[PDB]
Amino acid sequence: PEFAFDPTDPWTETFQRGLEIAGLGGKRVYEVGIGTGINVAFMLQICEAALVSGSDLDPRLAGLAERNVRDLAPRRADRFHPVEGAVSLIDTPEARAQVGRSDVIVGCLPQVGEPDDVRLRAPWAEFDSYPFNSVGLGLNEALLRRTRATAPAADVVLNFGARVGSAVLFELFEANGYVPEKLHSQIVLQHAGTDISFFVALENALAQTGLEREFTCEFYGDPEGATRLSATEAQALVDTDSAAEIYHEVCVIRGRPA
Amino acid sequence: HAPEFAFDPTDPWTETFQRGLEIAGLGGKRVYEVGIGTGINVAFMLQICEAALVSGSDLDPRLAGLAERNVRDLAPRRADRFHPVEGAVSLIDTPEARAQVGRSDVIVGCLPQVGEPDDVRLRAFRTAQAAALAAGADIAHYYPWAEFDSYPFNSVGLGLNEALLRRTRATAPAADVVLNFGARVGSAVLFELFEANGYVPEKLHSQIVLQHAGTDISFFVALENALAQTGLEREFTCEFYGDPEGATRLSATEAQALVDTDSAAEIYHEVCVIRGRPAL
Amino acid sequence: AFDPTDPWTETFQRGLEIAGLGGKRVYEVGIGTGINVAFMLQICEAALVSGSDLDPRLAGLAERNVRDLAPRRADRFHPVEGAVSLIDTPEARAQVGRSDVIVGCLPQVGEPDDVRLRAFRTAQAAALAAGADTRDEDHIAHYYPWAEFDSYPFNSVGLGLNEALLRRTRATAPAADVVLNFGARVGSAVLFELFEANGYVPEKLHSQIVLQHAGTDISFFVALENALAQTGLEREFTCEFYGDPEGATRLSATEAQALVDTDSAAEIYHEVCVIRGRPAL
Numbered sequence: 001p002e003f004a005f006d007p008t009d010p011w012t013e014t015f016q017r018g019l020e021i022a023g024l025g026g027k028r029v030y031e032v033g034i035g036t037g038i039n040v041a042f043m044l045q046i047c048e049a050a051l052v053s054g055s056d057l058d059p060r061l062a063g064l065a066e067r068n069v070r071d072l073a074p075r076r077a078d079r080f081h082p083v084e085g086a087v088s089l090i091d092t093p094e095a096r097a098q099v100g101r102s103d104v105i106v107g108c109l110p111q112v113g114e115p116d117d118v119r120l121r122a123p124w125a126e127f128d129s130y131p132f133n134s135v136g137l138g139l140n141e142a143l144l145r146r147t148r149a150t151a152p153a154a155d156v157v158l159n160f161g162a163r164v165g166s167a168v169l170f171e172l173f174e175a176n177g178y179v180p181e182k183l184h185s186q187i188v189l190q191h192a193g194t195d196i197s198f199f200v201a202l203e204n205a206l207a208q209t210g211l212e213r214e215f216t217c218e219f220y221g222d223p224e225g226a227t228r229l230s231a232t233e234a235q236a237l238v239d240t241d242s243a244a245e246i247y248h249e250v251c252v253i254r255g256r257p258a
Numbered sequence: 259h260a261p262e263f264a265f266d267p268t269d270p271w272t273e274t275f276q277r278g279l280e281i282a283g284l285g286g287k288r289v290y291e292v293g294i295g296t297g298i299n300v301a302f303m304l305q306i307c308e309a310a311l312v313s314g315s316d317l318d319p320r321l322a323g324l325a326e327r328n329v330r331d332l333a334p335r336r337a338d339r340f341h342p343v344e345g346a347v348s349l350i351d352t353p354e355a356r357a358q359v360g361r362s363d364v365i366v367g368c369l370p371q372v373g374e375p376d377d378v379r380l381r382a383f384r385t386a387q388a389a390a391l392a393a394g395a396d397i398a399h400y401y402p403w404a405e406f407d408s409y410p411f412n413s414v415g416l417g418l419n420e421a422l423l424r425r426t427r428a429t430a431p432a433a434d435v436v437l438n439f440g441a442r443v444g445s446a447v448l449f450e451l452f453e454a455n456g457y458v459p460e461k462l463h464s465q466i467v468l469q470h471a472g473t474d475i476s477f478f479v480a481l482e483n484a485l486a487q488t489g490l491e492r493e494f495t496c497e498f499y500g501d502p503e504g505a506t507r508l509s510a511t512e513a514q515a516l517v518d519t520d521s522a523a524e525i526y527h528e529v530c531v532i533r534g535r536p537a538l
Numbered sequence: 539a540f541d542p543t544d545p546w547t548e549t550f551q552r553g554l555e556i557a558g559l560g561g562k563r564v565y566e567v568g569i570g571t572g573i574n575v576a577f578m579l580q581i582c583e584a585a586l587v588s589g590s591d592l593d594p595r596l597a598g599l600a601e602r603n604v605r606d607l608a609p610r611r612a613d614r615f616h617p618v619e620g621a622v623s624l625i626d627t628p629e630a631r632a633q634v635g636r637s638d639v640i641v642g643c644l645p646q647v648g649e650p651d652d653v654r655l656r657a658f659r660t661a662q663a664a665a666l667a668a669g670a671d672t673r674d675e676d677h678i679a680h681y682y683p684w685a686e687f688d689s690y691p692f693n694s695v696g697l698g699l700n701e702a703l704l705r706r707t708r709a710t711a712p713a714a715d716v717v718l719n720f721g722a723r724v725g726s727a728v729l730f731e732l733f734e735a736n737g738y739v740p741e742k743l744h745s746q747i748v749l750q751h752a753g754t755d756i757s758f759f760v761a762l763e764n765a766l767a768q769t770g771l772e773r774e775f776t777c778e779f780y781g782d783p784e785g786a787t788r789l790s791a792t793e794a795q796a797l798v799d800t801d802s803a804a805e806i807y808h809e810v811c812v813i814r815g816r817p818a819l
């Protein structure tokens with residue numbers, strides 16, 4: 001089914017590819033950030049979810065995502081029950097009740113390193129305290145706190161830029177009650193006009209305390225990930241160059257609780 | 259509905275707490291107060307809220323002594339429902355207190371936090387002297403703050419509140435938790451302190467209160483110059499108000515300014531009671 | 539009995555003796571050479587013991603070791619193979635999931651500086667008393683690991699890996715006691731907070747005053763006494779050092795760095811204690 005996914009958006013594609021590997025067959029799925037519903041359409045038509053629910057921060061997409069679903073997978077669009085309203089993460093009673101019933105919570109959420117291209121406009125400071133905000137995933141840690149409390153037996157499947165390393169993405173889950181599994185990964189290319197200052201800032205400042213530290217971000221010179229390079233190095237070609245071609249992993253990780 | 263007399267209209271922080279406590283619905287519940295202090299809150303929960311049973315503790319072990327006396331003199335017909343745990347108790351960190359918390363339906367508290375009236379410590383002291391008359395002329399004494407500095411929400415001055423939420427979730431996972439906050443950092447943060455720690459927040463009640471004159475707000479000004487990376491920028495504006503009604507808003511700097519020009523200007527902020535319900 | 543050349547492990551083993559593991563099933567993170575495994579088996583009388591180590595070979599070396607040190611028992615020692623950081627393999631979680639007590643003496647700012655060197659030597663000694671007669675693969679090339687634990691709140695006092703462990707045990711074995719060895723330079727309240735912050739009630743099982751080797755850098759602890767709180771407003775933080783072997787004469791990190799300046803070689807002691815975390819039952 002290499003026709004279902006579309007290579008237009010590599011982030012979205014690796015998400016859907018992991019969603020498939022996830023094994024959503026006959027499950028109740030909640031999607032945080034349904035956006036336009038395509039992932040819902042995909043999870044209903046290709047992965048065969050028994051029921052899909054979800055929400056979005058934007059009060060209007062929930063309704064629009066019902067159309068696309070009705071149009072893109074008409075025969076299964078009666079298993080889609082969005083939760084309407086401006087729902088940040090899962091913070092309304094209905095969302096919690098729906099999340100409380102799901103087997104799998106899935107999403108691809110804001111995180112430093114996402115393509116700027118997003119929003120594209122046709123939720124930040126309260127998350128700043130989170131320990132894993134230090135590497136840009138505060139919002140993702142915020143969801144895991146809620147999921148472990150609201151549905152402690154549900155899987156959680158999330159999409160990540162992997163510039164910060166796989167050991168740390170895994171630690172985001174281990175720190176919050178889940179054992180992670182990488183379901184799918186892909187090397188993508190980032191636009192040429194994209195700012196990675198935050199990642200070179202990572203490998204330069206010191207540890208929690210004034211303590212010694214070695215750390216390098218995972219970047220790639222080629223679209224195959226053959227040659228590696230640190231945040232400081234990939235910024236070189238983009239200093240002596242202007243359109244150099246930089247790559248980084250994007251991956252989908254499942255967190256499965258005890 | 260509780261008449262308009264039981265609420266302390268002399269200290270608005272306590273008044274907000276008490277109006278909150280009555281909306282919380284403590285009738286018939288077993289309550290545990292972190293920091294019983296003088297016990298006037300206990301008197302209120304027994305006499306006005308109809309608590310079936312109120313327990314609690316305090317860091318200074320003399321208090322619970324005098325708390326009984328005040329309860330007895332304010333709620334004589336219900337004083338037999340008040341069983342505090344004796345001894346110096348920090349948060350709930352003693353076996354007796356953990357045993358009491360584990361049996362309570364609701365844990366309530368108006369804990370130390372950055373932004374509280376700067377005269378709160380001094381008031382407490384004085385009361386120690388007095389009241390502790392029956393002491394025959396007589397530690398930490400104040401929740402140290404070193405050990406609660408690791409907590410993430412200590413970044414907004416709520417580390418001790420967070421330490422409690424970490425304790426209540428482990429020891430009384432079904433219990434509601436009702437806490438008093440100054441709301442300078444805004445309700446998004448206050449709610450997130452609960453969501454981050456296992457609780458669904460609900461704001462029970464809130465008031466615009468006047469901050470004493472000459473109160474330091476530099477910590478809150480410092481929060482707005484929200485330092486970049488990692489990462490990175492953030493617009494963060496604290497919530498202050500110029501008029502009691504709270505119609506005119508200001509930020510920590512816009513307020514640190516109002517005072518700059520005219521010392522004595524009037525600066526208001528919100529105090530609110532939030533309940534955490536475990537998604538249980 | 540114990541070794542006098544290694545206080546941390548003397549106090550750690552003592553602790554184990556006080557924890558009352560008679561009858562229990564235990565899991566040790568960082569089994570190393572197997573000396574605590576034998577110590578629990580033979581002195582503590584544990585029902586059965588399991589454990590793992592980051593170094594993937596130690597597990598093989600350990601079973602042998604035990605067999606020689608705990609020949610009678612030792613049938614009750616089932617290690618888990620593989621390079622196991624903390625408890626992060628399905629087999630490890632399986633074994634942790636069914637233990638009554640997880641125990642560990644784990645890397646941490648303020649551990650002895652020569653601790654990596656003692657382990658190399660201890661591995662070298664043991665894989666000779668069992669063969670050997672090899673080269674220098676008795677050797678953690680790890681480095682690897684430390685960065686993923688940088689986000690943990692208690693890593694600001696150098697206990698990040700220890701916190702990272704508690705998050706795992708709480709989820710994997712919510713009813714299990716967790717017994718851990720710490721240098722108490724940052725103070726007993728901070729150590730207690732580490733458990734209390736992560737769903738455990740702490741208890742100090744045993745504590746010893748130990749000598750700091752001279753030469754040990756302690757600028758990190760003096761740095762605690764100077765930087766401000768997360769506020770960041772002023773803070774009052776004093777580390778717990780001592781001037782004497784009995785912990786009579788208290789002393790903070792800054793003044794302890796005074797001495798060393800002055801004398802360049804003064805004794806300097808601090809506390810090592812075993813704390814059990816027990817979760818609400």
Ligand SMILES: Nc1ncnc2c1ncn2[C@@H]1O[C@H](CSCC[C@H](N)C(=O)O)[C@@H](O)[C@H]1O
Binds near residue numbers: 123
């Ligand atoms: N705090 C929040 N809670 C719920 N949904 C959110 C949210 N913040 C953003 N969203 C929604 O999440 C959707 C995707 S935003 C994440 C895009 C991702 N970086 C990628 O490359 O694919 C958007 O529709 C947005 O409305």
Ligand SMILES: Nc1ncnc2c1ncn2[C@@H]1O[C@H](CSCC[C@H](N)C(=O)O)[C@@H](O)[C@H]1O
Binds near residue numbers: 547567592596622624
């Ligand atoms: N991340 C990790 N996961 C599991 N075991 C680890 C580990 N890091 C180190 N270890 C193990 O811990 C042991 C030595 S660390 C011991 C130092 C201790 N502070 C003391 O002074 O006594 C070795 O067996 C080592 O391989």
Ligand code: MET
Binds near residue numbers: 649684
């Ligand atoms: C055995 S790894 C030890 C390193 C330790 N975390 C330190 O920085 O002191």
